[PDB]
Amino acid sequence: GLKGPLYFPPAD
Amino acid sequence: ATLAGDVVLMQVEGDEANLHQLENRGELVGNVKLRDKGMLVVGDHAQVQLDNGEAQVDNAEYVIHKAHARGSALYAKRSENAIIMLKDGTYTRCEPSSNAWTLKGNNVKLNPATGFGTATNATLRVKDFPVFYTPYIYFPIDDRRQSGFLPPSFSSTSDTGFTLVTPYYFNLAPNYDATLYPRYMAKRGMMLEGEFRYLTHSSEGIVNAAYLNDKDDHREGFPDYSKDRWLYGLKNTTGLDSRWLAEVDYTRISDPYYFQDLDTDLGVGSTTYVNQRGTLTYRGDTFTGRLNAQAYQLATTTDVTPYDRLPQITFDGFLPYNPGGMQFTYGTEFVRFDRDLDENIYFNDDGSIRGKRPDASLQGLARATGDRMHLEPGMSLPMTRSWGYVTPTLKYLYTKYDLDLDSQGKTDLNKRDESFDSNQDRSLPLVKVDSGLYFDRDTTFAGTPFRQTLEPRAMYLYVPYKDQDSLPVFDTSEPSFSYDSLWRENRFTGKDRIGDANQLSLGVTSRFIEENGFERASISAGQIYYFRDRRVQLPGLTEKDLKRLNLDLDNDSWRSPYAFAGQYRFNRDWRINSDFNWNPNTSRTESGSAIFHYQPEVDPGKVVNVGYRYRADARRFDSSRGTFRYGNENDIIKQHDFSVIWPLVPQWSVLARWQYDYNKNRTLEAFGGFEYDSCCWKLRLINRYWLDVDDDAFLVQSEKADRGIFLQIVLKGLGGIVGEMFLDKGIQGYRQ
Amino acid sequence: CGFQLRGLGDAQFALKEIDVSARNAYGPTVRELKETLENSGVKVTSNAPYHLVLVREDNQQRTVSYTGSARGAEFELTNTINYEIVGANDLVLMSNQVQVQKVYVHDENNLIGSDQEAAQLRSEMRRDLIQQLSMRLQALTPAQLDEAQRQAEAKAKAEAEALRAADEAERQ
Ligand SMILES: CCCCCCCCCCCCCCCC(=O)N[C@@H](CO)CSC[C@@H](COC(=O)CCCCCCCCCCCCCCC)OC(=O)CCCCCCCCCCCCCCC
Numbered sequence: 001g002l003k004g005p006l007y008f009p010p011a012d
Numbered sequence: 013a014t015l016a017g018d019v020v021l022m023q024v025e026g027d028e029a030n031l032h033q034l035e036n037r038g039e040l041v042g043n044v045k046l047r048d049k050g051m052l053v054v055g056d057h058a059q060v061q062l063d064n065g066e067a068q069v070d071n072a073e074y075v076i077h078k079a080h081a082r083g084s085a086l087y088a089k090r091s092e093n094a095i096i097m098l099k100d101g102t103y104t105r106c107e108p109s110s111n112a113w114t115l116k117g118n119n120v121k122l123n124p125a126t127g128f129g130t131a132t133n134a135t136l137r138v139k140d141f142p143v144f145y146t147p148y149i150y151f152p153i154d155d156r157r158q159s160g161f162l163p164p165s166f167s168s169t170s171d172t173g174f175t176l177v178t179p180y181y182f183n184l185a186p187n188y189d190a191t192l193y194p195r196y197m198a199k200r201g202m203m204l205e206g207e208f209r210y211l212t213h214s215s216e217g218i219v220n221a222a223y224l225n226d227k228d229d230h231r232e233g234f235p236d237y238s239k240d241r242w243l244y245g246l247k248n249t250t251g252l253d254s255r256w257l258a259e260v261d262y263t264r265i266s267d268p269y270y271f272q273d274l275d276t277d278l279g280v281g282s283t284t285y286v287n288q289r290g291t292l293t294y295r296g297d298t299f300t301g302r303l304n305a306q307a308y309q310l311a312t313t314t315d316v317t318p319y320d321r322l323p324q325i326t327f328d329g330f331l332p333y334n335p336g337g338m339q340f341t342y343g344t345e346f347v348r349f350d351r352d353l354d355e356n357i358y359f360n361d362d363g364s365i366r367g368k369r370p371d372a373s374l375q376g377l378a379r380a381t382g383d384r385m386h387l388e389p390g391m392s393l394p395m396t397r398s399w400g401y402v403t404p405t406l407k408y409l410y411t412k413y414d415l416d417l418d419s420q421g422k423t424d425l426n427k428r429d430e431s432f433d434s435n436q437d438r439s440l441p442l443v444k445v446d447s448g449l450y451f452d453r454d455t456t457f458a459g460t461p462f463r464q465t466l467e468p469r470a471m472y473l474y475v476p477y478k479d480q481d482s483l484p485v486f487d488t489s490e491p492s493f494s495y496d497s498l499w500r501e502n503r504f505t506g507k508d509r510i511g512d513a514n515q516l517s518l519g520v521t522s523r524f525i526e527e528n529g530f531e532r533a534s535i536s537a538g539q540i541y542y543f544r545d546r547r548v549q550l551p552g553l554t555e556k557d558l559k560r561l562n563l564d565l566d567n568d569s570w571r572s573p574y575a576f577a578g579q580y581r582f583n584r585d586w587r588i589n590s591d592f593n594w595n596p597n598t599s600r601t602e603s604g605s606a607i608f609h610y611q612p613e614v615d616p617g618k619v620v621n622v623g624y625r626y627r628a629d630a631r632r633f634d635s636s637r638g639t640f641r642y643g644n645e646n647d648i649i650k651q652h653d654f655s656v657i658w659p660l661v662p663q664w665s666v667l668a669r670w671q672y673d674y675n676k677n678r679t680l681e682a683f684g685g686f687e688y689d690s691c692c693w694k695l696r697l698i699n700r701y702w703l704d705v706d707d708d709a710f711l712v713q714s715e716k717a718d719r720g721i722f723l724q725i726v727l728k729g730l731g732g733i734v735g736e737m738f739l740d741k742g743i744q745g746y747r748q
Numbered sequence: 749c750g751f752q753l754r755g756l757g758d759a760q761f762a763l764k765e766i767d768v769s770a771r772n773a774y775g776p777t778v779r780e781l782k783e784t785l786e787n788s789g790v791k792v793t794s795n796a797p798y799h800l801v802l803v804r805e806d807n808q809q810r811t812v813s814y815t816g817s818a819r820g821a822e823f824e825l826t827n828t829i830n831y832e833i834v835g836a837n838d839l840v841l842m843s844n845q846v847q848v849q850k851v852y853v854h855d856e857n858n859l860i861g862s863d864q865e866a867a868q869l870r871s872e873m874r875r876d877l878i879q880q881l882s883m884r885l886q887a888l889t890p891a892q893l894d895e896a897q898r899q900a901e902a903k904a905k906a907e908a909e910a911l912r913a914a915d916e917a918e919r920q
Contacts, residue, residue: 001152001158001159001160001161001162001180001181001183001731002152002155002156002157002158002160002162002181002183002731002732002733002734003157003162003181003183003189003191003732003733003734003735004156004157004733004734004735005734005735006186006187006188006189006209006210006211007186007187007211008186008187008211008213009185009186009187252771252772252773252775253771253773254773254774255774257774279811280811280814280818281811281814281815281818281819281820281821282819282820283820284819284820284856285856285859295774295775295779296774297779300776308859312856315856315857316857318859318860319859319860321860335787349860370857397756398753398754398755398756398758398759398760399753399754399755399759400753449753450753450754450759451751451752451753451754452751452752452753452754452758453750453751453752455750464751466751485858485861486860487860487861487863487864488861488864489855489858489861489862489864489865491852491853491865491868492852492853496850496869496872500868505861505864505865505868506860506861506864525883525887527887528884528887529883529884529885529886529887529888530883530884531880531883589849605851623812625812625813625822627813627822627853630821630853631853632853632855632856632857632858633855633857633858634857635857646816647815647816647821649813649814649821649822651813651814653812673814675816676816680814680818703818704818705817705818705819713817713819714817715817715818741810741811
């Protein structure tokens with residue numbers, strides 16, 4: 001696994 | 013249809029070629045190279061099927077360009093969805109000259125589009141030594157967030173024995189994830205920690221929880237002991253962009269010894285309490301209203317139960333004013349202090365007492381609860397010029413108490429021939445005059461222009477005396493003297509004591525400004541002149557209490573200690589901070605500190621931290637007296653802190669820290685260890701010694717010597733994190 | 749010696765308007781910072797050409813001294829503000845930070861009193877960081893900002909041109 005920072009989902 | 017030379021034709025290159033039969037196999041020989049977007053397979057033989065179809069390279073190697081990924085396989089097939097497969101395949105992110113680590117599986121599938129690689133009958137080898145087996149593994153090819161196990165952490169300490177943490181990461185969604193932390197501890201058991209992180213357009217926060225069925229019996233029979241060990245809390249922040257702002261910092265633990273046993277990550281000092289706070293805040297342009305429910309939970313048995321502020325409601329602000337006009341400000345507070353005292357008596361087998369609960373040393377008014385209201389309007393006339401200012405300020409302080417006292421406090425009171433007034437008011441005005449002058453001077457050091465400033469200021473402070481001994485202390489402390497003492501209208505924090513002041517504070521500060529407005533250095537000196545005694549005091553430092561317990565300071569003198577303070581920055585390299593407080597009425601040093609921090613901008617890997625701290629004037633509450641106290645000979649601070657991080661060789665790094673207390677002549681903490689980095693793997697090893705907080709079974713504060721070894725290897729490319737704690741807090745500048 | 753009382757020329761700002769905003773959009777720091785700027789002859793308006801932006805305001809706390817029982821005795825509170833000066837078209841002209849730190853004496857048996865002492869220290873620190881931000885704004889001149897933005901915008905369209913150039917270059 002690979003953990004990273006949170007971020008908002010792309011919307012399209 | 014043979015071809016030779018530099019044969020080229022998905023693209024199937026090679027030095028030699030031969031091609032073969034139609035509809036059948038289409039073979040290719042000699043230095044064959046299959047290539048694609050980010051993909052490459054090289055080998056001796058190749059076999060294709062149809063124009064668009066099978067490929068199969070024998071005795072093959074492969075390289076995934078965008079990642080640092082290569083491997084080899086007895087053979088390699090490419091299929092429809094560009095899913096290339098290897099047999100007896102290898103995978104690694106080490107350079108072509110390294111065998112630092114390799115993953116070797118029976119089948120290995122690679123999807124470079126998905127960024128997902130899998131292997132069956134997989135072994136992890138370290139320098140070709142097989143170290144770990146699994147019937148299956150998947151790993152990421154690109155560096156996208158994906159769920160799985162995360163890099164583990166080995167350690168061995170006194171409180172836990174051998175420790176293994178093998179976290180598992182749940183990548184639930186772009187804006188919220190979760191992580192499980194199974195901690196195996198040789199000496200206590202299997203602990204399970206958990207974290208949930210979230211992110212919204214309004215809010216942001218993190219949930220945390222942990223459980224552990226402790227097998228250690230060292231603390232069986234200690235007060236408030238618990239076999240089941242646990243922890244949960246929430247941090248949250250909502251509305252940073254709003255005029256409404258709700259905020260949670262809540263934690264709850266199972267037993268007071270939780271962090272003394274299950275944590276060696278807060279470093280020396282541990283923590284004696286956790287917070288339990290929720291705050292709603294409205295933020296208007298000229299005023300702020302705040303609803304704060306806040307309490308503490310003790311992680312210790314030798315401190316007194318804290319008060320809490322079930323409802324603390326505050327409304328502060330000021331009215332629109334005209335430039336240079338007068339100014340009106342207002343601050344208002346309603347608070348409710350409550351507290352449930354744990355004053356139980358712990359007897360031995362017989363009747364003999366083995367320990368005293370701290371809360372039992374609280375007598376009389378030190379046991380009150382109640383409501384307090386506080387209203388504090390003020391007016392001031394700032395008169396300013398380019399070169400100086402004078403600001404007179406008139407304030408009125410009104411506080412009302414609605415107290416409540418239990419039976420034992422009342423009996424303790426009339427045992428001292430005193431009565432309990434459950435309704436008490438206090439009214440007094442405050443006069444304050446702040447003035448100063450601004451001087452400037454251009455200079456040049458090492459050919460760089462400085463603007464040096466000279467800023468001297470005076471503040472007259474007048475507050476009449478009002479006997480406040482009949483009031484409890486809920487939220488009041490008495491800060492140690494410092495240069496910032498010279499400009500505060502109360503020598504006390506909080507609202508339970510308002511100091512009697514008729515004094516003058518004189519001080520000057522010189523600053524050094526570069527051309528862009530930055531500030532290289534600051535030097536400041538000042539002192540206070542007292543025209544009256546200082547009679548208002550904390551309970552047990554008033555004259556009546558002093559001769560009730562028979563002692564004896566800074567009561568009657570005509571001047572404060574001298575206060576010096578200064579900061580210097582050298583380019584963008586190192587930094588130095590110092591402060592010093594000398595008492596002329598006693599010819600002794602009240603407090604002081606020198607703190608050096610070195611860390612260049614050409615190479616942040618060199619980090620040196622030298623620090624000295626002396627302090628002998630702290631006023632702290634005393635668990636055994638039930639009152640406040642000044643001279644605490646065994647809490648004097650005379651300590652150094654040294655820490656280093658240095659690159660011995662461009663790829664190695666040494667790191668250490670020594671923290672020493674002269675007042676008792678003992679090392680508080682000392683550790684050293686190395687941290688090697690390479691293309692494909694890093695390794696950090698730390699030997700450490702430290703004095704950990706301990707409450708023994710007799711309710712007496714102690715400390716225990718703990719030793720620890722901490723080990724983390726990380727195979728770059730085989731999962732990880734992109735974003736220890738004692739190594740972080742204890743060494744200023746562990747940031748790369 | 750050689751000092752001289754500060755003059756009305758060397759105390760004014762020479763930057764009559766600016767826009768101010770912060771991630772904590774209504775926090776005390778950005779509110780007090782706009783209060784100070786208006787009180788110094790600088791109009792705080794969103795219609796300004798240039799935008800001071802407080803992108804981060806990190807408070808932290810570290811234990812720097814210990815009791816006789818090896819518990820925390822002094823906290824070092826550090827406040828750090830990270831800002832950006834931003835031109836039009838969302839181009840960042842400048843980018844830096846300010847930092848203050850202060851130490852106080854923590855009392856295990858007086859947690860609200862400690863919290864009160866810390867809150868006072870935090871409010872002082874807030875005024876320290878604000879006056880540092882304003883020195884750095886006083887040192888700015890609309891000339892230096894217009895030039896910075898002209899240069900950075902020429903850099904931006906130079907990058908757009910060098911990119912579309914390689915676009916048609918690798919188109920065939
Ligand atoms: C019982 C048979 C039934 C089969 C079980 C089914 C298994 C399939 C399901 C698992 C697939 C999940 C894997 C996904 C991998 C991933 O997501 N992510 C990728 C890693 O990020 C893969 S590597 C995995 C990591 C993890 O490190 C970890 O967390 C390991 C995870 C395992 C933890 C949980 C196991 C618990 C089982 C016990 C309860 C079971 C009940 C028992 C009934 C039998 O290995 C690492 O990457 C860190 C490893 C690097 C450390 C190396 C250091 C070596 C020593 C140094 C020098 C040595 C010698 C050199 C000198 C000569």
